[PDB]
Each structure stands twice: as structure tokens, then as C-alpha cells.
Amino acid sequence: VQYFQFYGYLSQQQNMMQDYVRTGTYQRAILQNHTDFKDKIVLDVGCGSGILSFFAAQAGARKIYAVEASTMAQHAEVLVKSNNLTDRIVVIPGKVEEVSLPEQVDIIISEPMGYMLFNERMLESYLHAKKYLKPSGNMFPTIGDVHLAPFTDEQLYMEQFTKANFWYQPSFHGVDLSALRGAAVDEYFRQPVVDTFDIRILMAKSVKYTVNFLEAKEGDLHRIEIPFKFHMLHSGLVHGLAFWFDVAFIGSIMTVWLSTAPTEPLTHWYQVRCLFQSPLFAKAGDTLSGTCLLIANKRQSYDISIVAQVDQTGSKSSNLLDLKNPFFRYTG
Amino acid sequence: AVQYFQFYGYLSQQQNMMQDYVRTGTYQRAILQNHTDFKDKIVLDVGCGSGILSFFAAQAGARKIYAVEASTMAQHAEVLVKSNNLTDRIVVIPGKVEEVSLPEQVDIIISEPMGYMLFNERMLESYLHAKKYLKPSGNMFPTIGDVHLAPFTDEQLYMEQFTKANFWYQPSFHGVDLSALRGAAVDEYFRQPVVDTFDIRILMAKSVKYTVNFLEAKEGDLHRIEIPFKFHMLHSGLVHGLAFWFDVAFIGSIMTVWLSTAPTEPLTHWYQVRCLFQSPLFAKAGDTLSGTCLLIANKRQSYDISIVAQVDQTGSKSSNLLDLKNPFFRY
Amino acid sequence: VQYFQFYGYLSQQQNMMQDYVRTGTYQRAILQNHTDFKDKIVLDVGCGSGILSFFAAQAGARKIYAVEASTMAQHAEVLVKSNNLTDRIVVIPGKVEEVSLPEQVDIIISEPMGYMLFNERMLESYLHAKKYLKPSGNMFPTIGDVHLAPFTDEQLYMEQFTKANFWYQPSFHGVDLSALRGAAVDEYFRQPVVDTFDIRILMAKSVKYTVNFLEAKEGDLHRIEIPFKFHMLHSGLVHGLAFWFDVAFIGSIMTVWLSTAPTEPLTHWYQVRCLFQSPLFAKAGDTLSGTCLLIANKRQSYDISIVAQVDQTGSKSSNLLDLKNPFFRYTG
Amino acid sequence: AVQYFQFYGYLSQQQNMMQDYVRTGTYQRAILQNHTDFKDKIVLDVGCGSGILSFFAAQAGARKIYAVEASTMAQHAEVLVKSNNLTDRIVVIPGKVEEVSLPEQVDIIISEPMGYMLFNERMLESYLHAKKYLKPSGNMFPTIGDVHLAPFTDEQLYMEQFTKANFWYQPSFHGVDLSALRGAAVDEYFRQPVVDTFDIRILMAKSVKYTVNFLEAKEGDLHRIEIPFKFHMLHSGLVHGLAFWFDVAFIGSIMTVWLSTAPTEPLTHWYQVRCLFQSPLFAKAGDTLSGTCLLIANKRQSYDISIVAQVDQTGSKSSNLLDLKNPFFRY
Ligand SMILES: Nc1ncnc2c1ncn2[C@@H]1O[C@H](CSCC[C@H](N)C(=O)O)[C@@H](O)[C@H]1O
Ligand SMILES: Nc1ncnc2c1ncn2[C@@H]1O[C@H](CSCC[C@H](N)C(=O)O)[C@@H](O)[C@H]1O
Ligand SMILES: Nc1ncnc2c1ncn2[C@@H]1O[C@H](CSCC[C@H](N)C(=O)O)[C@@H](O)[C@H]1O
Ligand SMILES: Nc1ncnc2c1ncn2[C@@H]1O[C@H](CSCC[C@H](N)C(=O)O)[C@@H](O)[C@H]1O
């Protein structure tokens, strides 16, 4: 509930700000689309530091309502004063779903993307605020693609068992821990892995899943069924699925893309890998079918259910992951 | 706290404490080498986690061990009690020690309730709370706890933190002035305790110690903890803040056994904790550096931490707040 | 059979030579006992480089027969020539048990000590050569003590399981290896550990076992029964037994000791630890009883059988070790 | 050799080869990615050890795999075949490939018969021997093997080895002259191949490669192996000897896959092998350094290795023997 404490620290805000791909692209998108802003009314949902509102101001917006739920709002307000933008940017402390704007807006801007795009469940707030949009008003970003794909990583699916095996000692300071080995394995396999990777570990082309923020409703995000049918370009043991995302700022003048793909430069979102507990053997030619099912939970996250089978063999694999507790493997 | 008990509910977290040999092994050495403190006795383990301390209790020859765990871990602990044929003797009791009801009074309580700076997490309150089940002449493991503090010089540390805050002194970041929050940035980062280890060379005075005798302290003593100090400086330099570590003593019937987190001793998972002054104090050898640490307990289960210090000679004062909720693990 | 190749390399000879405790003590022992040598006849069994014969020459021996089985003999001969000792030192290529000396000798010198003293089984050659000793002739060294004692080392008994657990992977490149986990554990526990250690890991005073080279027969070394009864000075988990040895040069003038104890400086013999596969819990006061049984085998070594029980509990432990394949844990 | 087969009889030794991911993983990639070379075929694994290559064979869709192991390991391999339900398809056959009798001819032989310098251990002879069970148009894994060699400069190496031998140039060691064997000491140590890795910067010329096509070579070809070379020097310096590494290619029906032990490639358990000259040769850039490696097979299952080299410009020759029986593992 109070993960807003997390967003209160300037250090956390700094982290996002310093992601040049993230913050630069946002700026590019807005100023390169100045007509979507010149003397328009704006809603910045979750402004934090304010940076996005400050960009909307650069592009000529008349009025920008910058809503922030955390105590980061106080510093947003201090910033609007020293920049002398009190005439154009209004900070509103609170949640979008609880505060009241004095006016309908022309465009909504926000950076509500989490790991796997959906993590933190802020996109539901983004959508929630369409209640303030003027009809035919725009949203920045406008759409998001989630990509997923099969990977082969033997060493990653091995770290998992090497770790768990602490619990396979028959005499730790004289205690037999081996009865707990199974539960340890299970814990590590419930953890989505956060780092990047060589793109060569991929075994099929991604399949994408599109959310259009102009059309989608707040409740479309409680249950995200991602059906997949892969056509394996390479033979090997498949150790799980890799996920990444792209967002799109469709402006009047131009479409700008902010991509978090293994191919584009690295961002603070890295990529997310979900291991299978049973590797599937596939060969080039085969189809890897299943569905990835994302079920919104109480801890502002998603229960991930991944069912996959190789159509030719028929051998199958099913895994359940806990997105609120990931493993950050990124070191260098 | 809901998040605190979820934390110790992950096997990975229990494994990490267990994997710390110095900790895990000292406890065993403590328990086993004063077996008389256990042989044929009734034991209480407060927050037994994996169950590891109660097993050591069983090895010493205890008769009955009540192992209270409040996390999910309760269930995993009981599995281990079965697979080890200690169903005999180890009764896993799910819940908080405050809330459960043991059927009996105990000859000795054992526990590992320590956090960074000794007091972090505030489990010593629970540990002392459980004294209500302690018999007269009943021992405790640990028995006492010394907190040590000493002034340090480490400019690299100071710059490292300072330069982070100095992100917020920019005249235009993508054409945006952040300098107004320059102040607030320094405040926040320097509220952070740096957790890592260091070469003892960086220390500039014998440490003052603060002793808490667990046999005698009430739960409410820990609500306000006031640590005065007087450092007789031993080297001239910039004083960049304070380093904190703790020792713990298992005063047994046969032997005392220490578990230390001193920078001079072998490294543990607690590492050491340094706080930083926003601006270093200048001190000469032979000078006196004095002040107090105030540790006010709070709703949210920390720790509002205050450190005022002044070089008496020059009257150079420095006051600091510490946000134990936001450590900077520099390792 | 042809481990004599090993002793052919000058590098291997150098290694022993460079052990200052070993080579210095030998020298000290001989010259400090010059009367045992002045104009006496000597047999150096396994002279290698010759170093010991060269010491006997320094102490005034009339005649020294230096027997060497390996091709190291050729270099021994080259060395006797350049030192100009052809008059006093005779190199005889071959085994003691196969060559023939031209004469009975007054003293036998040799360094036939191996790991745990007995390893390599050269002491049987040392004893074998008593057939050349003049009655009331002496032997250098004269006696050896083997010491053993209980130790506590949790981390050492843990390396063993952490290693074995490679074999506890359910899917290594897709193969389940776990059926072989037991045999892996067994292999590591059959391996005596060679390094040194802090003496504080000891839990009882050593018990010694004495061989007197003046009296012992070649066949007393095929079967070495070492009965032990320890009185635990400390409480803890006992993870096996530590072994080390001492030898004694009992001269007319003086007894010199060459000690390989954890307390004396480190030598190239280090110390040998044998882990139990089941740790025994003991407390100060308790007796740790059992026998260590050393049974000479085909690979010029010893099968070690260690039976131990704690008398108070009655819980017992039995282990079998393979001395021809040790694990050298010594690094720094 | 009795000692060679005892060596691969220890699980620890099999584990060490398996743990080498580059090796173990390249083979898998090789087998699995040209599955057609296996799908529904009859396979021979020569010296299967743990059984690991035959399992990959099974995964590719083979029909019958004859896995010959000569060590104790035969028994452990069969255990794994049972616990994996591949009793179906993997027939463990104890003994040497030379001595056993397979009931059938095979569509493809697979093996990992490589040692340091490719040829060490001499198992390529066994590998090629097994061609007698190979059908016509039958493939082999690996198919070919390139040996690479190139001159290197590394004075630290040269001194390190030299200073060891210089123990034997002492006028009196505990009053004893060893200098007479000074010569013989240098001989011995410099017969040793140094096994470890190195920065590619130390190499002074493009490597010449020596290709052995396994599809075509008879067992007796490997008895005398003569490797001529001509290095067009690329830097002036002291030439301290030669570095040797090998690559191996799995020429499949779908793809070629290389497994390299190049100093430019990721490190493997074979590391790289350098030989040392007793005295370095001096060479200028643009100079030609030429000579030959002679590798004469011998009773005792090595390797008598000869290396003569001369800087043509100056006529500076250097001849060396290499004792593959005595490597100096400098890692
Ligand atoms: N439901 C909600 N209502 C108001 N603010 C919210 C919110 N959910 C998340 N936020 C805030 O939105 C911020 C998201 S991080 C984005 C920071 C800033 N917009 C930037 O682009 O750099 C956090 O500070 C968070 O506290
Ligand atoms: N008030 C309380 N009542 C019961 N258990 C508590 C508690 N406060 C903390 N704990 C539990 O006690 C454990 C402390 S960590 C120590 C674990 C274990 N005794 C060991 O030595 O490794 C955690 O599992 C935590 O969940
Ligand atoms: N049975 C035997 N007959 C002759 N020489 C033997 C032998 N058994 C072992 N040796 C030789 O004795 C040597 C033992 S190492 C001792 C070297 C030398 N005496 C010194 O003290 O430095 C080896 O060189 C070995 O080859
Ligand atoms: N001539 C021969 N006949 C049968 N097996 C042999 C052999 N020469 C060597 N071997 C065995 O083949 C193995 C080579 S090591 C390779 C092991 C396994 N194929 C892997 O890839 O990991 C050893 O176990 C060795 O004992």
C-alpha cells in the first residue's frame, strides 16, 4: 500500500531521471510534437520530480496539472517555484483516482511502465485518468507492446539448483536440511530474473502483445492472457521465456518509440526472464505453444502462470512466478 | 510489520544468515560448550526461523525447546524437526512471542535478535519481552550486548555520497533547474547509513562502548537510547562521521563466548555501519570530540537516530539524523 | 611399481632438499653426532641427490654406500665426482632389497618418511636393510611417533558435500545426475585431506604410536593397529582425526628430533586429516574411543579404516580412506 | 596404461570435464543443432565416461547408442542410463574400443578424445581405431582438428622456470656443490610444457595451423607427427618459445560448430600450452622464423616431442625436447 515511501526519496527519482534513454526519449517525444502541446491543457499522472511536466512546459502547454501521490510532490512544488512556472504548472498531491482536477485536459502524459511493463500496476492509474481526457484527447505514451520469446541459458538454470542445494546438506552443524531442498528449489523458480543478455540466446522471434491506452479500460489489466505460438529457429533446451517492452508516443507530427529491447541500448528496466522448472527440448522447425497468464494480486503486482509445450514431442512445462519478488542478476 | 515477517519467510533469507559461519558457528560453540546451561532443561527460542538454534539446543541435551517463529518459516522449521527425529523435544510454536502462550516457564531463552547497529529491526524488544517466561535464576543467550562507536576518516566515502546528492545542484537538467532541492538531496543521502566493511586504519580514537545487559533491561528501555561519548583524538584529520559495530556475549555456566562484528574481527553478514556527517569536523590529535547518539523508537518499527558531535577545542558542532529505513549497502 | 620415475626428476629431489626443516635437521643430527660417523661405514638407503651421504661425509665417515632405485642415481654419481668424494661415497643403483653391498655397515641413514609417516611404504625398505647392519649398529632416524587427534572443522566437512552436489542436479544439459550423488559423496570422503590447520581445532591431546627402527621387522608395517582412547577437552562435533609425525635421531652425543607437528614450523609433509562421514557429537569429559587400522595395499600405500564412537552416547562412526589418492587443500 | 584408466575412473575427474561449460555446451550445441546426423540413427560414443555425450545423442533422437567406457566409470554411466529411462536406447559397453565387439555398424561416431596440445593422452588413436565400425558415408564428431602454434615473448615465464633450475647451480648447498648438475636441471625444466593461459598481446606472428581430418586419418598416422612452420615475425623481441592451442570442428549436415581453445576465445579446462626454449631466439620484425615440431609416439603412451627453430636471417638455431609426461600447471 505505502510503496509511495519508495517514490518519496529523491534518490529513486534520480535513478529514473538519469536513465538517458528513458528521460531523453520522453523529452524528444514531447518537443518534437510541439503542436500536441502548444497552448493545450495537460495531465501528468505521477509527476514525481516534475521532469515530464517541465517538458510539457518547454513545448508550450498553457496549463499542466501534475499529480503526485508520494511526498515527492512537495519537492515537485519547490521545483516549479524556482523554475518560475507557477503560472503554468500546478502540483496536486494525492492519487489520480482520489484528487480532483479543475478542468478536462487535452493530453495525458505519464511514465507508468514497470518491469515486464505491467509491474507496480500503475498503468491502471494511467488508464483510470482517462476520466479527465477531453473527447479525442491524446495519451503519451499511446500504446505499449510486450514482447516475449524462448531462450536457452544453461548457466542461469543451474544457478537455481546450485543455490537451492545449500538445503541438501545432511549435516549442517549437525542438522539434516535435505527435507527442505524441494521448497528451496521452488522459491528460486518463483523469481523472475532481472538482467540483460546476449540476443543470441533467443530461439524464436518474439511475439508481441498490444495495449492501446486510448481504448483500453482499467480492468483489462487484472487479467492479461498472452497466448503464444513460437516457431523455433534453433534447436536446444528451452529454459524459459524472456520479456521486454516498447512504448509509443503517437503525436500529430511524429511517432517516437521508447524501446527496452535486448537489441536497443540498456535501460533501468533491463529485461525479465522467467525460467521453466522443466526445460523443454525443442528443435528448429518445432512449435512452442502455450499461454502466459498475468493475474493482478494484492501486493500491487502480477501472478505469472506460464504454460508451455513442444507440439512435436508433446512434453510440457508449467511454471508459476511471483513478480513482486524478482532476482536482480545484473552485475556488469 | 507485515513486510518484516514476509522477509524472514523466504528460505533464501534464512539461508543467508545460516551461511554466515562466524554467527552460526559462534552460537553453536556457545550452546555446546556450556551444555550444563541446557542439559535436561526447558528452552525458549524466540524467532527460531529455520530452527537452527533450537537444534543446537537439542544437541546440548535440552529436554524441551519451545521455538517461536512468526513468519511462514514456522512450517519449514517443523518439517526439519520431523526429518531430524526431534519431535521428542522441539515444539515449533507459530506466532509472535508477545501473542503466544507457552505452557511452561523456561530455564533459559536463546535468540539471535540482532540487526545492523545492534538495534535495527527492533527485535531486542521482543527478545526482552519474552523474559516473562523466564524463571528466577534463568540465563539468556546472548547475555549482554556492547555497542561500539568510533570516529573515522574516509574522504572517498564522503565524496561518493556527496557527488550523488550533487545531481540535485544542477542549473539545467534537460533545461531544468534542480538547484532548489540541492539542500534536500544532501539531507536525504547523509541520513543513509553506509553498510560495508573498512580497514581499521581509518579509525581515529579508541571506541567507546555502550553495554545493555539483557538479564536486566525492560522492553521499554530500548524506546529511548541515549549514547554519550568522548573521543580523545589520536590523529589529526577530517572527521567524516562515526563507525558502529557490536559485540555479543553468551555468559554461560562454563565459559563466556563472544560474537563480534568488530572491524578487527572476521567479517559477518552485519558488516559494519558507518554514518556520515554532512560536513566533516576538523580535529587535532589530543583534542576531545564529544556529543551523543539519540535513538528514539518509533511507530514503523524504527529508529529515529540523532547524532550531535563537537570538537570541544574549536566549538565545531555537527548534528545529523539517520534514516535506518534507507541503508546504502556499499558492498 | 614405477613411482621411481617420480623420484628421477631433479625437481622432486629439489623439493625435499628445499624443505629447510627437513634437510637442516638431518644435517644438524649427523654433524652434532660426529662420533656416530667418524671413520664408520654408512648405508644411505634411497640417497636420491646424495645430500644425506654428503652429510655423512662431512661428519667423517670412512665409507658410505648410497643406494638409489631411480635414475636419480646417475646424478648422485655425477655429484660425488665433482665434490671429489669418489674415495668415500659409493653410489649403488637399484633397490636395497636387490643390490649387494660389499660390507656390513655401522649406521643406517635414510629419509623414508611419507604422509602420515607410513605413506609410500619406504619404511619397509628402511627396515629391510637391517640385514647390512653390524650387530649393535645404529639407525638414523631411530624411532618414529605417529600422533593422531580429534578435530572440529565444519567448513572442511562441507566442502565435501558442496563438491559432491554437482551430482545432485536434476537437469544438467538435460540429464538427471542425482542417482550418482551418493557415490560422489563417498569418493570425497575416501580422500585424506593434506594441509595444515590452527591447532585450536583440536579437541583432545594426541595419542602417539611408536615404531622403533632398531627393533621393528619389515612385516610389522603391513598391519598397523592404532587403538585410541581420547578424553575430550572441548565440546563439539568431531569431524574426523588429524595425523602428524615425529622422528628421532638418537645419537651417542645427542637426540635430535624432526617434528611435523601443527605446533612446529610447517614442512613439506603438512598434516593429514581424515574426515568421518558421520560427525560425532561429544562434550568435554566424554571419551572418544576406537581404532585406526592401516592395511598395506598393492599401490604402495595404506587402506585406512577408522572406527570411532563416543562412549557416553554410544553413537558411532566408521570410515574407510584411500591414502594413495589424497586431496591437497593447502593454498596459502 | 593402468594409471590413465584409473584417472578417468574418479567421478571428480569426470565432473571437472563436465563442469567445463564451453566444452560440454559446444558438444551439446553441435549434436542438437544437426539432429539429422542422429535422428533415428545408430551412434557410437568412444570413452563415454559419465555418459554425457550419449545423452545428447539420445536428445537428438538417435535410435541406438553404443557407449564404450574402459574405466570403472562404465558402471556409473549405466546407473545414469537407468535413472534417466534411456535403457531403451543407450547401451553401455565396458572395455576398450579396440577390444570390444559391437553387434552392428554405426551411422556416426562421437567422442571427446582431446588432450593438451590436442594429442596428449593419445586417445585420438583409439578414436580413429573405432572407424572400423563406421559405415560408408558415416560422419564423425568431431570431424577435423586444427592445431595452432605461434611464437611468444614472456620473460617472466622464462625467468620463473630458469630460476627454479638455478637451484642446481649452487657452489655449496649445506656445504655441497650441485653446479655439476646445473646443465641437467635446465634440460629437465625446459622439457616441461607450461600449461596456463595468457594475453594474446604476447604472441608475435600469425599462427600456422596443422589440420588432421578425422574422416580420413588412419590410426598409425599419429605415430609420427611432423609440423613444419614459417613465422613471418611481426614484432622485434626475444622469442621465448611457442604457444600451442587447438580448435575442433563438428562438420554436420546442418551446420559446422567449432570448439576452440584459442587464447582469443573463452577459457577451457585445456587452457593453452606453451613450450620454452632454453635460450630465447632474437628476431626482428619482418624476419622469418622457421623449423619443425616432431611428435614421435612412444611406448608409455606419449609423445616424444621435438622442436627445432631458427631465425633465418641470423642462422640462430634452437632445438628442444618436450616431456608431455611432466607438465607445469602454472594456473
Ligand atoms: N496512482 C497514483 N497517483 C498519483 N501518483 C502516482 C500513482 N501511482 C504512482 N504514482 C507516482 O508516479 C511516479 C512514477 S515514477 C515516474 C516519475 C516521473 N513521472 C518521471 O517520468 O520521471 C512515482 O513518483 C509515484 O509515486
Ligand atoms: N516478535 C517476534 N516473534 C516471533 N518471531 C520473531 C519476532 N520477531 C522476529 N521474529 C523472527 O525471528 C527470526 C530472526 S532471524 C534469526 C533466525 C534463527 N534464530 C537463526 O539463528 O538463524 C526471523 O525469522 C523473524 O521472523
Ligand atoms: N626400495 C628402495 N631402494 C632404493 N631406493 C629407494 C627405495 N625406495 C625409495 N628409494 C629412493 O629413496 C628416495 C627417497 S626421497 C629421499 C631423498 C634423499 N635421501 C634425501 O633425504 O633428500 C627416492 O629417490 C627413492 O627413489
Ligand atoms: N581406448 C579407450 N577405449 C574406451 N574408453 C577410453 C579409451 N581411452 C580413453 N577412454 C575413456 O574415455 C573418456 C575420455 S574423457 C571424455 C568423457 C566424456 N565423453 C565427456 O565428454 O565428458 C575417459 O573416461 C577414458 O577412460
Distances (CA, A) of C224 to C218, C275, C324, C325, D142: 12, 19, 17, 19, 51
Amino acid at B209: K
> DSSP letters along B255-290, please?
---EEE--TTSPP-TT-EEEEEEEEEEEE-TT-EEE
H helices present in B166-210, as ranges: 182-190
Q: Residue D306 and residue D322: Cα distance in Å, rounded?
A: 6
With CA atoms as reference, report the closest residue to A69 among A14, A120, A143: A120
In contact, C80 and C50? CB cutoff 8 Å? yes
End-to-end CA distance of chain C: 33
Question: Exposed e or buried b for every residue in C167-194, given b needs 16+ CB within 10 A?
Answer: bbbebbbbbbbbbbbeebbebbbbbbbb
Q: How close is the Cα of B95 to the center of ligand 3, in Å?
A: 69
Burial class (CB in 10 A: 0-12, 13-18, 19+), B321: middle
The neighbouring-strand residues paired with D101 are: none
SS3 A274: strand
In contact, A300 and A3? CB cutoff 8 Å? yes
The neighbouring-strand residues paired with B289 are: B231, B311
Q: Residue B275 and residue B241: Cα distance in Å, rounded?
A: 6
What is the CA D100 to chain-centroid distance, rounded? 25
Mutation test of the interface with chain A: which of D28, D29, D32, choosing the one with the most A Cβ atoms within 10 A? D32
Ligand nearest to the CA of D126: 4
> Which of the 8 DSSP states describes residue A202?
B
> Which of the 8 DSSP states describes residue B181?
G
What is the CA D213 to chain-centroid distance, rounded? 15
Length of chain D: 331
> Which of the 8 DSSP states describes residue D200?
G
Cis status, amide bond into C141, omega within 30 of 0: yes
Task: Report whether B83 belongs to an annotated binding site.
Answer: no
Mind spelling out the 3-state secondary structure of chain C? Answer: CCCHHHHHCHHHHHHHHHCHHHHHHHHHHHHCCHHHCCCCEEEEECCCCCHHHHHHHHCCCCEEEEEECCCHHHHHHHHHHHCCCCCCEEEEECCCCCCCCCCCEEEEECCCCECCECHHHCHHHHHHHHHHEEEEEEEECCEEEEEEEEECCCCHHHHHHHHHHHHHCCCECCECCHHHHHHHHHHHHCCCEEECCCHHHECCCCEEEEEECCCCCHHHHCEEEEEEEEECCCCEEEEEEEEEEEEEEECCCCEEEEECCCCCCCCCCCEEEEEEEEEEEECCCCEEEEEEEEEECCCCCEEEEEEEEECCCCCEEEEEEECCCCEECCCC
For the CA atoms of chain D, what is the radius of gyration?
22
H helices present in chain B, as ranges: 2-7, 11-18, 21-33, 52-60, 73-83, 123-129, 155-165, 182-190
Q: Which three cell numbers stand for residue C284?
A: 568435554
> A143-332: which CATH number, 3.30.1360.30, 1.20.1090.10, 3.40.30.10, 2.70.160.11?
2.70.160.11
Q: Which three cell numbers stand for residue A140?
A: 503519451
Beta-sheet pairing, A302-310 with A316-322? antiparallel
Q: What are phi and psi of B94, to 5 degrees?
A: -65, 140
- The boundaries of every CATH 3.40.50.150 domain in chain A are 1-141
The neighbouring-strand residues paired with A308 are: A290, A317
With CA atoms as reference, report the closest residue to A275 among A162, A180, A152: A152
Say yes or no for a CB contact (<8 Å) between D80 and C166.
no
User: What's the order of all strands across the beta sheet hosting C133-140?
Assistant: C89-93, C63-68, C41-45, C105-109, C133-140
Reported as half-sphere exposure (CB side, CA atoms, 13 A), residue A102 has a value of: 8
Beta-sheet pairing, D328-329 with D194-196? parallel
- The boundaries of every CATH 2.70.160.11 domain in chain B are 144-331
Those residues with Cβ within 8 angstroms of residue B308's Cβ, 6 or more apart along the chain or in another chain: B291, B292, B317, B318, B319, B320
Q: Residue D293 and residue D227: Cα distance in Å, rounded?
A: 5
**CATH class name, domain A1-141:** alpha beta
What angle (nearest 5°) sits at the alpha carbon of residue A114, between those of residues A243 and A53? 135
Ligand 1 atom index nearest CA of A112: 14
Looking at domain B1-142, its CATH superfamily turns out to be Vaccinia Virus protein VP39 (3.40.50.150)
Q: Residue C47 and residue C139: Cα distance in Å, rounded?
A: 15
With CA atoms as reference, report the closest residue to B30 among B48, B56, B54, B67: B56
B→A contacts (Cβ < 8 Å), by residue, are 10-12, 15, 18-19, 24-25, 28, 50-52, 55-56, 59, 76, 79-80, 82-84, 164, 167-168, 173-181, 184-185, 188-189, 325-326
In contact, C287 and C230? CB cutoff 8 Å? yes
> Which of the 8 DSSP states describes residue D135?
E
Q: Residue C40 and residue A143: Cα distance in Å, rounded?
A: 102
Q: What are phi and psi of B128, to 5 degrees?
A: -75, -35
With CA atoms as reference, report the closest residue to C61 among C83, C80, C84, C43: C43
Burial class (CB in 10 A: 0-12, 13-18, 19+), C257: middle
SS3 D16: helix
Those residues with Cβ within 8 angstroms of residue C49's Cβ, 6 or more apart along the chain or in another chain: C10, C13, C17, C72, C75, C76, C79, D178
Q: At what angle do helices B21-33 and B11-18 cross, to 10 degrees?
A: 70
Say yes or no for a CB contact (<8 Å) between D80 and C23.
no
Residue with cell 570411532: C308
* Nearest-by-Cβ selection for A10 from B84, B185, B325: B185
Amino acid at B7: F
Beta-sheet pairing, D64-69 with D42-46? parallel
Which residues from D are below 8 Å from A155, CB to CB? 21
Q: What share of chain A is helix, strand, coil (3-state, %, to 5)?
A: 30, 35, 35
Those residues with Cβ within 8 angstroms of residue D124's Cβ, 6 or more apart along the chain or in another chain: D113, D114, D118, D145, D212, D214, D222
Ligand nearest to the CA of A122: 1
The answer, yes or no, to whether B and D have at least 3 beta-carbon pairs within 8 Å is: no
Q: Residue D6 and residue C298: Cα distance in Å, rounded?
A: 14
Q: What are phi and psi of C259, to 5 degrees?
A: -110, 140
Cα torsion angle, B17, B22, B25, B26, sign: negative
Q: What are phi and psi of D298, to 5 degrees?
A: -150, 165
Distances (CA, A) of C167 to C276, C325, D67: 21, 20, 20
Other C-beta atoms closer than 10 Å to the C-beta of A183 total 14
In contact, B194 and B328? CB cutoff 8 Å? yes
Other C-beta atoms closer than 10 Å to the C-beta of D116 total 22
Q: What element of type H or E holds A306?
A: strand A302-310
In contact, C165 and C141? CB cutoff 8 Å? no
Distances (CA, A) of C250 to C26, C131, C253, C256: 12, 20, 8, 7
With CA atoms as reference, report the closest residue to D80 among C180, B308, A9: C180
Report the structure determination method: X-ray
* Nearest-by-Cβ selection for A83 from B28, B167, B176: B176
> Which of the 8 DSSP states describes residue A253?
S
Beta-sheet pairing, A327-328 with A193-195? parallel
With CA atoms as reference, report the closest residue to D309 among D209, D233, D197: D233
Those residues with Cβ within 8 angstroms of residue B49's Cβ, 6 or more apart along the chain or in another chain: B8, B14, B17, B69, B71, B73, B77
In contact, C14 and D168? CB cutoff 8 Å? yes
Q: What are phi and psi of A148, to 5 degrees?
A: -140, 155
- The boundaries of every CATH 3.40.50.150 domain in chain D are 1-142
Residue with cell 505519464: A110
Q: Residue D284 and residue D291: Cα distance in Å, rounded?
A: 17
Q: At what angle do helices C181-189 and C156-164 cross, to 10 degrees?
A: 150
With CA atoms as reference, report the closest residue to A323 among A114, A119, A112, A160: A119
The neighbouring-strand residues paired with C288 are: C230, C310
The neighbouring-strand residues paired with D212 are: D145
Q: Residue A174 and residue B31: Cα distance in Å, rounded?
A: 13
| CB-based pocket (< 6 A), ligand 3 | C 4, 7, 16-17, 46-49, 51-52, 67-70, 72, 95-96, 111, 122, 125
With CA atoms as reference, report the closest residue to C291 among C212, C209, C215, C197: C209
For the CA atoms of chain C, what is the radius of gyration?
22
H helices present in A98-228, as ranges: 123-128, 156-164, 181-189
Say yes or no for a CB contact (<8 Å) between D180 and C82.
yes
Mutation test of the interface with chain B: which of A20, A52, A175, choosing the one with the most B Cβ atoms within 10 A? A175
> D144-331: which CATH number, 3.40.50.1000, 2.60.40.420, 2.70.160.11, 3.60.9.10?
2.70.160.11
Q: What element of type H or E holds A223?
A: strand A223-231
Distances (CA, A) of A158 to A162, A185, C31, C162, C169: 6, 11, 62, 14, 8
Mind spelling out the 3-state secondary structure of D287-328? Answer: CEEEEEEEEECCCCCCCEEEEEEEECCCCEEEEEEEECCCCE
With CA atoms as reference, report the closest residue to C52 among C131, C119, C112, C127: C112
Other C-beta atoms closer than 10 Å to the C-beta of D46 total 24
Beta-sheet pairing, B64-69 with B90-94? parallel
Expressed in Å, this structure's resolution amounts to 2.7
Q: What element of type H or E holds A8?
A: helix A4-8
Other C-beta atoms closer than 10 Å to the C-beta of A86 total 11
Which one of the listed residues C44, C77, C111, C286 is annotated catalytic? C111
Beta-sheet pairing, C133-140 with B224-232? unpaired
Question: Exposed e or buried b for every residue in B274-287, given b needs 16+ CB within 10 A?
Answer: bbbbbebbebeeeb
Q: Which three cell numbers stand for residue A62?
A: 498553457
Q: Which three cell numbers stand for residue A232?
A: 523455433
Q: Residue D248 and residue D29: Cα distance in Å, rounded?
A: 13
Q: Residue D276 and residue D118: Cα distance in Å, rounded?
A: 18
In contact, A73 and A48? CB cutoff 8 Å? no
With CA atoms as reference, report the closest residue to C161 among C178, C142, C143, C184: C184
What angle (nearest 5°) sits at the alpha carbon of residue A103, between those of residues A101 and A104? 105
Q: Residue B259 and residue C275: Cα distance in Å, rounded?
A: 27
Q: Residue C69 and residue C121: Cα distance in Å, rounded?
A: 14
With CA atoms as reference, report the closest residue to C318 among C284, C286, C282, C275: C275
Burial class (CB in 10 A: 0-12, 13-18, 19+), C278: middle
Q: Which three cell numbers stand for residue C100?
A: 649387494
Those residues with Cβ within 8 angstroms of residue D135's Cβ, 6 or more apart along the chain or in another chain: D105, D106, D107
Q: Which three cell numbers stand for residue B172?
A: 539545467
Distances (CA, A) of A70 to A12, A74, A120: 12, 9, 14
SS3 A132: helix
* Nearest-by-Cβ selection for C279 from A157, A162, A174: A174
Other C-beta atoms closer than 10 Å to the C-beta of B253 total 10
- Identify each DSSP E strand in chain D by its residue range: 42-46, 64-69, 90-94, 106-110, 134-141, 144-152, 194-196, 208-213, 224-232, 237-249, 258-260, 272-283, 288-296, 304-311, 316-323, 328-329
Ligand 2 atom index nearest CA of B126: 1
Q: What element of type H or E holds A29?
A: helix A20-31
Q: Residue C98 and residue B242: Cα distance in Å, rounded?
A: 76
In contact, D190 and D256? CB cutoff 8 Å? no
Task: Report whether B191 belongs to an annotated binding site.
Answer: no
> Which of the 8 DSSP states describes residue A166?
G
Residue with cell 638407503: C45
Q: What are phi and psi of A44, to 5 degrees?
A: -100, 105
Say yes or no for a CB contact (<8 Å) between C9 and D178.
no
With CA atoms as reference, report the closest residue to C139 among C260, C36, C51, C50: C36
Distances (CA, A) of B222 to B129, B301, B303, B304: 11, 12, 10, 12
With CA atoms as reference, report the closest residue to D260 among D150, D120, D122, D147: D147
